[PDB]
Ligand binder design. Structure first.
Ligand SMILES: [Ca+2]
Ligand SMILES: [Ca+2]
Lengths: 98, 94, 79, 103, 103, 95, 98, 79
DNA sequence: GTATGAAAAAAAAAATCGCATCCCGGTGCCGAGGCCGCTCAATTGGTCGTAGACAGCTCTAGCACCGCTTAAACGCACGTACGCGCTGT
C-alpha cells in the first residue's frame, strides 16, 4: 500500500502553486463574501465583474505575502509549522495592528 | 522675511479647551507640523477625488469625503460634524 | 456567513504559494479573520469612492484608488 | 472675518488662499476652506485637550512634546492617524514585555 | 512631431498636456515633458527587455503578466522601485526556505 | 464610446525596438499601462513639491531631473538622468 | 560588597530611559558622522544646527523603534537576548532589505 | 571612521528605550551598520534637496522633506 | 508496569543592609506671555466665464434563469514527524 511521508506532498504542492499564477480562491464564494461585506456600508450595491476580480487579486497576493512573512516568523522560532502567534507577530511588525 | 505659522490659533483653541494651561515652543512647532501634515493629506486626497471624477472644483463635499477616508471612525464623525456645522453656519451668515 | 466559503484547502493553497510546509489548525480561522479585516478596510474606502461619484455600482477604478490609498497599489486594472 | 461667520478661530481666509496656491485644482468651492479649517481646529483641539490632561497629571502648566506623544499614543485613534509620524523629544510609552520581568 | 525631435517613441506632446492639466504647477518648462517622456520610455524599455528574455526562457512569443513579475522581481533595482506594487496574474518567484527541504 | 487614452501603442513600438519577434498579452499591457501612469504621478508629484518648496511656479526639465534622482534607485537613475539630459539637448538643437 | 543580579539594573535602565526624552547618542560624534557621510555626495557643505538635531531625532527614534520590533523577534524565539538575526528578521518583514 | 563614535553604551541606551533587557555583543556592529544605511539613504535625498535649491548649506527643512519621502515623517522642525 | 513513605534538592519566607528612586522645600534663569509698529493678506463687491446641475437617450453590462458535468470540498482515521518541555554544559 503506497503512501508519501508527511510533508513530501506539501513540498510538491508548494513547487506547483509557486510556479502558477491562477487565483486559488473559488470565484463565487469570494464574490458572495465581497457583497456580504459591502452590505455593511450600503445596501443593494452592484459590482463591475473586474472590480470583484481586482479585489480577489489584491487579497490572494496580500495573504500569500503575509504567509511569506509568517513562515519566516515560524522558522525564526526553529519551527516548520506556522501558528496564529506567527501571523500576529508579522502584522505587529508590519504595523497592521498594535 | 515673514514666516507664517498656526501658533496664535492653537493658543486661542488651547484657552477654549484648557484656559489655565500653556504650551512649550518645541510642542507648538509639533502642533504646527501636525496641522500642515493633515492639511496636505486632505487637500491631496480631495485634489485626487476631483481629478478622479473630472471636476476642476474642490467643494466642501470633496473635503468631507476625503476626511471620511483619512480619519478613523469616531474622529471622522466628530470632524464631519464640526465641518458640516461651520459650513451651515457660514452659508446662513451671508 | 460567506467567510467560511474561504475553504481550509483554499487557504492551504495560499500558504503553499507563500512557501509554507506545515499549517496548524488554529491558522485557518486566524486567516479568515485577517482576510475579513483586509477586505473590510479596502471595500469601506472603495465604496466611499463610489458613494462620492453618486453611483450605486462599484467600479474597478474605485477598488484601485482605494488599494492605492491603503499602500497596496495594484497594476492591471488601469491605475 | 469669514472665520467669525463660521464661528471658528482657524483662518478660513488663509486656508482658502493656501488651497488655490497649493496646486490641488484650478477651482476651490468657497465652502471647502470653512469645512477644512473646522476639521483642523477640531483635531488641534482634540489633541490639546488630551495633552492638557497629560500636562496636569505631570503637575505642569505648560505642554511639552512628551505630553503630545503620551496623549496621541494612549488614544487608539490619534495613534493610527499619526502611524508613520515621529514626534521630536517624544520618548516612548513605558512598556516592558512581561517575559522580561523577574520572578 | 516634438517626439521625433527628441528621438523618442513616447508622446512628448501628450506628456506636456497631462502636466499642465494635472494640477502640478501653474507653469511647465517645455524641456520637462521631453525629459520625463524619455525616462518613462527608458524604464518601459528596461522592463520589456528583461520581460522579452523571461518570455524566451518559457519558449513563448507573447509577454504575459507573469513575465513582467519574473523580470521585475529578479532585477534588484526594478523591485525596489515597485516595492508597494501588486502585479495582476503575477504569481511569486519560486522560493522555498532551505530548512524546509529534506536531508 | 468613452475615448479612454492609453500608452499601449508606444509600449508596442518600444517592444519591437528591444524584442522585434516578441508580443504582449492585453493583461500584461494593462500592467505596463498602470506602471507608466504610476511613475508619472510619482515624479510629477515630487517635482510639484520641489517647485512648491523653492517658491517656483514653473516645473522645468531641471525639477524633473532632481525628482528622478530622489525616486529611482542608483544605476536606474544615472541611466534615466542620462537618457533625459540626452533627449532635452537633442530637442533644443533640433530647433 | 553589595551587588545587583544580572538584569536588575537593565530593568531599572529601561524604566529610566523610557520615562525621559533626551537624545542618547553624543551630539558631536554624531554631527561629525553626518558631515563625514555628507562629503560622499558633495564636498564643502554646511549644516543648520537644527538640521543636525532633526537627523539625530529621526535616527534615535528609528533605532528605538527597530529595537522594539527586534526585542519581539528575539522573545518570539523564547529568547531574552536580542541577536543580529533578530534585527535582520525585523528589517526583512519591515521591508528594508530582502 | 566616526561610526565607532556610536559607543556600545549609547546603543545599549537606545535598546533600553526599546525595552530590550539583554544584548548580544555582535549587535553593536550590526546596529552601526543599519544606522549608516539609514543616515546614508536619508542624507543622500536631504542633500539632493539642498543641491536643487543651489545652496551649499543643508536646512532643517531639507532633512524633513527627505524623512517625509522615506516614510519617516518628523514633527518639531517645521513642514 | 502502578499507590506507600523518608532522606536528596530545590524552592519559599523572613531579619540585616544598603541602595537607588520619590517627595519636600528653596535657588536661579530663561523662555513663555502680552505691548507696538508695521505689513500683508483678508473683506468688499462688481466683471466675467465656466463648472456642474438638470433632465433625458443609449446601451452596458450586471442580476437571475437553467440543468449537467466536474473537480473541489468535507470528512475519517492511522500513524509519523513536529512540536514542546525537561535537563545539563
Ligand atoms: Ca440587486
Ligand atoms: Ca488602546
Amino acid at each position: 500500500p503506497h503512501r508519501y511521508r508527511p510533508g513530501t506532498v506539501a513540498l510538491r504542492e508548494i513547487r506547483r502553486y509557486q510556479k502558477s499564477t491562477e487565483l486559488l480562491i473559488r470565484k463565487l464564494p469570494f464574490q458572495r463574501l465581497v457583497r456580504e461585506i459591502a452590505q455593511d456600508f450600503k445596501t443593494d450595491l452592484r459590482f463591475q465583474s473586474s472590480a470583484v476580480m481586482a479585489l480577489q487579486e489584491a487579497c490572494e497576493a496580500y495573504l500569500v505575502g503575509l504567509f511569506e512573512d509568517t513562515n519566516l516568523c515560524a522558522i525564526h522560532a526553529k519551527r516548520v509549522t506556522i501558528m496564529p502567534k506567527d501571523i500576529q507577530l508579522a502584522r505587529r511588525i508590519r504595523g497592521e495592528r498594535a | 522675511s515673514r514666516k507664517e505659522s498656526y501658533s496664535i490659533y492653537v493658543y486661542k483653541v488651547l484657552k477654549q479647551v484648557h484656559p489655565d494651561t500653556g504650551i512649550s515652543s518645541k510642542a507648538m512647532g509639533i502642533m504646527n507640523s501636525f496641522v500642515n501634515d493633515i492639511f496636505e493629506r486632505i487637500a491631496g486626497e480631495a485634489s485626487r477625488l476631483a481629478h478622479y471624477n473630472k471636476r476642476s472644483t474642490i467643494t466642501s463635499r470633496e473635503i468631507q469625503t476625503a476626511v471620511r477616508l483619512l480619519l478613523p471612525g469616531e474622529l471622522a464623525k466628530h470632524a464631519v460634524s464640526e465641518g458640516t456645522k461651520a459650513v451651515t453656519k457660514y452659508t446662513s451668515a451671508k | 456567513d460567506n467567510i467560511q466559503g474561504i475553504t481550509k484547502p483554499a487557504i492551504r493553497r495560499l500558504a503553499r504559494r507563500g512557501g509554507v510546509k506545515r499549517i496548524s489548525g488554529l491558522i485557518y480561522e486566524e486567516t479568515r479573520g485577517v482576510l475579513k479585516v483586509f477586505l473590510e478596510n479596502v471595500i469601506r474606502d472603495a465604496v466611499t469612492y463610489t458613494e462620492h461619484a453618486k453611483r450605486k455600482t462599484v467600479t474597478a477604478m474605485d477598488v484601485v484608488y482605494a488599494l492605492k490609498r491603503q499602500g497596496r497599489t495594484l497594476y492591471g486594472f488601469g491605475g | 472675518t469669514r472665520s467669525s461667520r463660521a464661528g471658528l478661530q482657524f483662518p478660513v481666509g488663509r486656508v482658502h488662499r493656501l488651497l488655490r496656491k497649493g496646486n490641488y485644482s484650478e477651482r476651490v468651492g468657497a465652502g471647502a476652506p470653512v469645512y477644512l479649517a473646522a476639521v483642523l481646529e477640531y483635531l488641534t483641539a482634540e489633541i490639546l485637550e488630551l495633552a492638557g490632561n497629560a500636562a496636569r497629571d505631570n503637575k505642569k502648566t505648560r505642554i511639552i512634546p512628551r505630553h503630545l506623544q503620551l496623549a496621541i499614543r494612549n488614544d487608539e485613534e490619534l495613534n493610527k492617524l499619526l502611524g508613520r509620524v515621529t514626534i521630536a523629544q517624544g520618548g516612548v510609552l513605558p512598556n516592558i514585555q512581561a517575559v522580561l520581568l523577574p520572578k
